Write a protein that binds this DNA or RNA. Structure first.
Lengths: 97, 85, 63, 44
RNA sequence: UUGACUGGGGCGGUCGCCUCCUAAAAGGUAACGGAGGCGCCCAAAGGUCCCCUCAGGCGGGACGGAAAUCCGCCGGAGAGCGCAAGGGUAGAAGGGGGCCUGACUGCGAGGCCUGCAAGCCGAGCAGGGGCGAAAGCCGGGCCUAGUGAACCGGUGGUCCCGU
RNA sequence: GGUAUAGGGAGCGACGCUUGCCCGGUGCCGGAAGGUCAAGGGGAGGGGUGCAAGCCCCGAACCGAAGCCCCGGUGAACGGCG
RNA sequence: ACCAAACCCUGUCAAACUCCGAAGGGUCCCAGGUGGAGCCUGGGAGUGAGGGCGCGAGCGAUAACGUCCGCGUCCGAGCGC
RNA sequence: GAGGCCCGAACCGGUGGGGGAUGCAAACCCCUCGGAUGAGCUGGGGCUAGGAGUGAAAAGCUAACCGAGCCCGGAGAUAGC
RNA sequence: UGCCUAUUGAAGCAUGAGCCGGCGACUCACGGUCGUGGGCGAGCUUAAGCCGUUGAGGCGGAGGCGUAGGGAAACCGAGUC
RNA sequence: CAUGGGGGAAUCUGGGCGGACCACCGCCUAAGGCUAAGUACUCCGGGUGACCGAUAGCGCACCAGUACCGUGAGGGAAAGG
RNA sequence: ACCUGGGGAACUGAAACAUCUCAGUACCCAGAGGAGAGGAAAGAGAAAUCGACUCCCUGAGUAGCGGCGAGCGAAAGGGGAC
């Protein structure tokens, strides 16, 4: 009947306006150390239906391991993720529709 | 009843909380840098080799080593850290 | 039935990964305490020992 | 008085504390800004 | 809705913080036990460099108490240290002077204390400064009181969000 | 199915002799002035947008009741009477 | 005539006096010590109403099966022998 | 031959005392008391209700416990006891 | 020096019980957290519903955990603030 | 989106909406009405039960919403071989 | 019993209590019927999108609401029934 610890201040700012959440594009992350798991042409859909994603939306690759050559489509890559497979791979990307 | 009529001139209920002072690291104790060695009222223990004190006279080690105390009478009591090998 | 998550707790604490409860520092909240002291500086985030075991249990679903 | 020093022609604050009646007014003094290094910082 | 403590309750007193004592030679330690403070203050009462050393007592000196100001010996601290008490202190933390504004920004190893959350000390690195020839010292004040979680708002500022 | 020689409320309580002083404070009554005052009237002036006309917003003067302040009466009004 | 300042003796007193100062207590190191010992993480608790006795101190009246603390112990839970 | 006149039955009431106290009785009995043409007593038929009624006013009465009736429901109220 | 309960402390002159026989109190639902017995494992798993059964079980991937974290956020990413 | 009060239009160069307000971009046609099914319930009929078996199961296994209680609303048994 | 409408509590919870909660629940009233209600977009909301309504499973204790306390809590979209 003291104070709990509802004493700690809610820093969590930028939190909840009113109409609600803001429909914004989410990006699911997936390392290529879990990607090289197979080969050929790896692109969204090809994932979800397996491994990670599931309508998780945007597919941004990145990660540890060492992916092998195989044009890999995506929505985003890391300044690392790119260079990493730059050794041999793919630069598929964005959309225009 | 057989009641009385007591009262209180009490004008003394009071005191500050303990501040726990003293030699926190006696001589011979291996210590890392920063370990405050002594919490003192005034300069009850002067800082020696490899020992510095701050605002509240709190003495603390400046290196890693063993603590050694020393009397200097007219000079005072010192505390310091001797490194090692 | 389906415990409801405790909003307030959610509004003020972020639980890391290894299972640590972390929140801000009481004291500086827009001072209101006032005129500095180089103390204001020392205000990042922190680990709430033993009281998080409880803190945590209030976010059973929100995770 | 709860004083603070406004670096002339910019922002920042130092959050000092004067003594008014006790000879004050026109407080200002070389402080270090966050927007590059020093200026003087006035009152307000 | 109209509090709690309380050698029944009411009345009375009190309610947080600092300092002695109680406290039994580490800490810590109760009682409506003994005894006092705080809810501020310094733009110099803060930095640094350079100088000086007190209070008293004893003579001697126009006005001049029994200390106005001078001179001479003696006087290790009984003065001073903004305000309570305590600890500390002249091999200065005291008195005066010149330049200053570190009463900085980013941080923070390692500890003290501790149920929590709070409080306290802090070397060192970076930046850009002060004082000093220099070694160096400087993130307020001889040190401990001078303070109040959150929530709700107010003023500014800005890399952020903005259905 | 009444009309101030009546109705309602209050206090005192047949009858006799009487019922002093105090309107500072409270209440009530009286005061077409002033003071303050909410909607609303009013729009000086400013802001958001557009290419624009515009559409939208905040908003000062000033005009604005009862109440209160203020001025005054009042004790078989609450009360008070060294 | 010490009515009486300091000052010197002769005698003393003090929780909030100390020139001095034990026993003892605290901690670190090296050793001993295999214990219903320890240390780390996690599940479940109950307790938060104590009491007597001895020793050390307050309050009391150098009273109380009084009252508060401190170290220890036993009862509590060993009203079993 | 008047009267909120007097004594005193009926009738209405309930002063003091005794008894009664698992009663004859959940308020009674005996003696003794007050009123008794009046603001009287009484039959029958009607009306007023739960924060409401009624009240010559005790917070009295409102179907044998009324500082807020009874019944059912909210309802397994809540109970740090 | 009974039993139970409550207690610092009960045979206790503290609570409860006349005696017996029946009734009589830690449950279930949904979330969650540890532990544990199993299936499967970078994967694991189905809801509602459709099909069979008439005490046959199938099917059903919408969805849900998990595979990356930091940061209020933009954002970045084995990093990040 | 509804609407008590005041003001009070337009008919596709019309009018509403996409979270204050503008501007873009896009959605929809207010101030008249009807409309199966899939859904809910269990007085009633049937079928099952790791449901009860007469202090249980319904308040009623029986001549029970009875006897009895209460002015009333209402309360409400026992009893099977 | 179930349903729609019109009215509509308190106890409790917040370890007091007034916002809030319980709760549009209990109850009262009108009406409907084997059901009642709703129902063919002046809709939804970001999708070159969807296409009456109702019911179930998700979405989701999310978005949000809240003396930002106690506590309350969607919708779109996706599966189904029809």
């Amino acid at each position: 009947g003291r104070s709990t610890t509802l004493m700690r201040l809610p820093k969590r700012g930028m939190q909840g306006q009113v109409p609600g959440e803001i429909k914004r594009p989410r990006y699911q992350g997936v390392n290529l150390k879990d990607l090289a798991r197979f080969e050929g042409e790896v692109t969204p859909e090809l994932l979800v239906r397996a491994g990670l994603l599931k309508k998780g939306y945007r597919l941004k690759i990145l990660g540890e391991g060492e992916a092998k050559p195989l044009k890999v489509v995506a929505h985003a890559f890391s300044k690392s993720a790119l260079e990493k497979l730059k050794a041999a791979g793919g630069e598929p990307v964005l959309l225009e529709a | 009843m057989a009641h009385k009529k007591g009262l209180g001139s009490t004008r003394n209920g009071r005191d500050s909380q303990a501040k726990r002072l003293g030699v926190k690291r006696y001589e011979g104790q291996v210590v890392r840098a920063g370990n405050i060695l002594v919490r003192q009222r005034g300069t009850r223990f002067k800082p020696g080799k490899n020992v510095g004190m701050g605002r509240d006279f709190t003495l603390f080690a400046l290196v890693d080593g063993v603590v050694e105390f020393q009397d200097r009478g007219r000079l005072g009591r010192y505390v310091h850290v001797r490194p090692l090998a | 039935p389906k415990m409801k998550t405790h909003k307030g707790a959610k509004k003020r604490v972020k639980i890391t990964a290894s299972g640590k409860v972390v929140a801000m520092k009481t004291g500086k909240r827009h001072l209101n305490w006032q005129k500095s002291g180089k103390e204001i500086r020392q205000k990042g985030r922190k680990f709430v020992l033993a009281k998080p075991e409880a803190e945590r249990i209030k976010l059973l679903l929100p995770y | 008085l709860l004083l603070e020093c406004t670096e002339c022609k910019r922002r920042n604050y130092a959050t000092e504390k004067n003594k008014r009646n006790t000879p004050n007014k026109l407080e200002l003094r070389k402080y270090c800004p966050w927007c590059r290094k020093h200026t003087v910082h006035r009152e307000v």
